[PDB]
From Swiss-Prot, chain C:
Knockout mutant characteristics: The letAB mutant is not sensitive to lauryl sulfobetaine (LSB), but the pqiAB-letAB double mutant is more sensitive to LSB than the pqiAB mutant. Double mutation also increases sensitivity of the pqiAB mutant to caprylyl sulfobetaine.
Name of the featured protein: Lipophilic envelope-spanning tunnel protein B
Family statement drawn from the similarity comment of this UniProt entry: Belongs to the PqiB family.
Taxonomic source organism: Escherichia coli (strain K12)
Induction of the gene: Induced by a defect in lipopolysaccharide molecules.
Protein location: Cell inner membrane
Free-text domain note: The seven MCE (Mammalian Cell Entry) domains of a single protomer of LetB resemble seven beads on a string. Six copies of this linearly configured protomer associate laterally to form a homohexameric assembly. The LetB hexamers form an elongated tube consisting of seven stacked MCE rings, each formed from the association of six identical MCE domains, with a central tunnel. Rings 1, 5, 6 and 7 are dynamic and adopt open and closed states.
Subunit note: Homohexamer. May interact with LetA in the inner membrane. May also interact with partners in the outer membrane.
Outcome recorded upon mutating residue 30 to N: Loss of activity
Role noted for this protein: Forms a tunnel that spans the entire periplasmic space. Is probably involved in the transport of lipids between the inner membrane and the outer membrane through the tunnel. Forms a dynamic tunnel sufficiently long to mediate lipid transport directly between the two membranes without the need for a shuttle protein. Binds phospholipids. Lipids bind inside the tunnel. Required for outer membrane homeostasis. Contributes to membrane integrity.
Length: 412, 361, 52
């Protein structure tokens, strides 16, 4: 409740109130301000001076008189919004003391709207200033990648969301065979840390694919987008075996596996990706098999029943006579790989039933979900040299009979 | 401005007229006609040029609900607009037909209804339980159409659904052979495939080639890939269907290289013809002398003295796939044409793993 | 003659996939109440049955 201008006695008296200062030269003429606010602001006109100009194709609940915020603090106010030929030009005023709070590298986004957010942390109501819920709030900040945003367009462009405003950096294009799992604002993560964001989805009538534009942050643009980088949309896996991903029900993301090579900045969406990034430093060997079978991305590699590696990918050679499976082993188990190493496919349950002896055993192995590949080394006093970065083995059609009794001593 | 609306979607006298959420004019009055409501609105003379012949009106309002990782967020409109009302008018490209139809511009009860412009198609369905008014129609996850009308016929045992396709996709689609399929959630012990269809179901589109039809029927299954469509579509003749269906994988040495587009019967009902599309990159894998067999479930051999059984939790135990190979030979057969018919072998070849045929390119 | 009456009003906050709808717009429905009427084809039997 504000009763300004004059009190009751001040109103029945009338006249001109005087606010003394400290020093002056007694000039001949003085301006008459309308009220104390205009007297303090030294503004003769009713409308404030235009300081910030923004352009927006659509108006995300702004209107005239919205509140301008610097990290949720009242700094200035939106003077006016004017409709241009195909957009809207927003004029905003800021205080002279706060003119230094913004610089050339600055970004604006639209918050305000009566937001009642319910989550595990509780309930948050974002109508505190009592003017945001009625008019609107526009928040601005300074970023490092905002230089490109300043360069593009005539001037600064208001963003409809905080994520859209923060979406700055390098630009990449992903070709996908289905955009049902893709959405605007979809996060792009490496090892659970946000490193990119999808900003545009476009359908092509000629080519049967969807081109998605993504922005990678400047801290990770050089590390990623180096060719061979794999982007995979993670999906929830609810089955009788178990549940793996459950946050993707409400917040799906795109997992990234980095690659090495020349920069590409043009990738394609894959289907599966190893979300470990712990075998990447190890050896990536190739196994040639007559048939694929149960193999896939994420297939375990087992030395004496212990998971020591994974299968990065599967492909066919130049001649279509065998399937080449590229698998990465761990560093600590790298010395387990030798030139004369035997590899076999352990998938499902295998049992032997003789003419007189029936013995069957089950072990609820993970091979009954993803048929793994096991490997061993035959015994020998002269040990073979360790396999190089590129080494090709052959997948045996059957498990060796006496691999358990070998007991080869592998140093280190 | 004069608008007609069968129902009043929270308008009332004195509502606020908006041009992309900006105060432009005000609703003067609403008058009840014989079977509708005529809404009279005033706009400023300076803003009279903001609207043209091609314009659309929709009713906004109170709040928006978003469910995501941060939880359930209820973003409310500004209090003045929510209390007084909100009618937003925009300009579209397909609004010329809406202007032509009727006496004048017609107010729409929803923004989707206002944006629903373009070509008109009719879909015949055997069940409208999965259909709803305003249902989106998507190709590769991109909105290209919208269902606008559901009508039940007493004479013919079917439901006719009217749909509007956007002008950017009306020529590309509706060319005969186009398949529309209502996607449904698949929650099973094997896994979960679709979960956004719990709250927002849509109709997936597989495009076709031919003369324009503009009259289709609702199917049951549709390959939601659109990556094999450029490849060869061959036919396999089998004595029995078995585990085959739409989406059945085609495997070369255990790797999915194609899918099954459809199944049908020939002119004579003595065999089942399965139309399957192979990928472009694996197209050269298809030859004239290629052997096809049905890999479904788990197959094992138990001799008189030897018992060895193996399992591999194959996808064939959910959708029994079809595998193919090529016998070895120094003169390679020419690649199969667009229309090529093979015969499904009743049993897997014994020594197909030891062939190792070299296929260039 | 063929007409039906029903009782609307009551502060209704409906949440669904379409979003949130609040039905307290006229500011008198939430305090007193609203009764909505219309004309139907089968309302002749309803008019015949009962006193009125």
């Amino acid at each position: 409740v504000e009763f300004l201008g004059a009190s009751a006695s001040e109103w029945i008296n009338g006249g001109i109130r005087i606010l003394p200062g400290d020093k002056g030269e007694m000039k001949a003429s003085y301006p008459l301000y309308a009220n104390l606010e205009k007297a303090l602001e030294n503004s003769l006109s009713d409308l404030p001076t235009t300081t910030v100009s923004l352009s927006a194709e659509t108006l995300p609940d702004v209107q005239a008189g919205s509140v301008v915020l610097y990290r949720k603090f009242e700094v200035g106010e939106v003077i006016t919004v004017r409709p241009r030929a195909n957009a809207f030009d927003i004029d905003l005023h800021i205080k002279p003391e706060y003119r230094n709070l913004l610089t050339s590298n600055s970004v604006f986004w639209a918050e305000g709207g009566a937001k009642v957010q319910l989550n595990g942390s509780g309930l948050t109501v974002q109508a505190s200033p009592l003017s945001r819920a009625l008019k609107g709030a526009i928040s601005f900040d300074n970023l490092s990648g905002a230089s490109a945003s300043q360069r593009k367009g005539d001037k600064r462009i208001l963003y409809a969301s905080e994520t859209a405003a923060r979406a700055v950096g390098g630009q990449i294009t992903l070709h996908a065979f289905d955009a049902g799992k893709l959405a605007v604002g979809m996060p792009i993560r490496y090892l659970g840390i946000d490193i990119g964001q999808i900003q545009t989805l476009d359908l092509i009538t000629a080519r049967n694919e969807v081109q998605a534009k993504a922005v990678l942050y400047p801290e990770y643009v050089q590390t990623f987008a180096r060719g061979g980088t794999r982007f995979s949309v993670v999906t929830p896996q609810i089955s009788a075996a178990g549940v793996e991903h459950l946050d993707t029900i409400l917040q799906p993301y795109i997992n990234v596996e980095p690659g090495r090579g020349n920069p590409r900045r043009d990738f394609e969406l894959q289907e599966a990706t190893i979300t470990d990034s712990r075998y990447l430093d190890g050896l990536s060997i190739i196994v040639e098999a007559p048939e694929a079978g149960s193999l896939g991305i994420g297939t375990p590699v087992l030395f004496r029943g212990l998971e020591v590696g994974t299968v990065t990918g599967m492909t066919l050679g130049t001649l279509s006579d065998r399937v080449m499976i590229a698998m990465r082993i761990s560093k600590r188990y790298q010395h387990l790989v030798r030139n004369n190493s035997v590899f076999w496919l352990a998938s499902g349950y295998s049992l032997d039933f003789g003419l007189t002896g029936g013995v069957v055993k089950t072990g609820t192995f993970n091979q009954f979900i993803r048929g793994g590949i096991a490997f061993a080394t035959p015994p020998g006093t002269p040990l073979a040299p360790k396999a190089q970065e590129g080494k090709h083995f052959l997948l045996q059609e059957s498990e060796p009979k006496e691999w358990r009794e070998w007991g080869t001593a592998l140093p280190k």
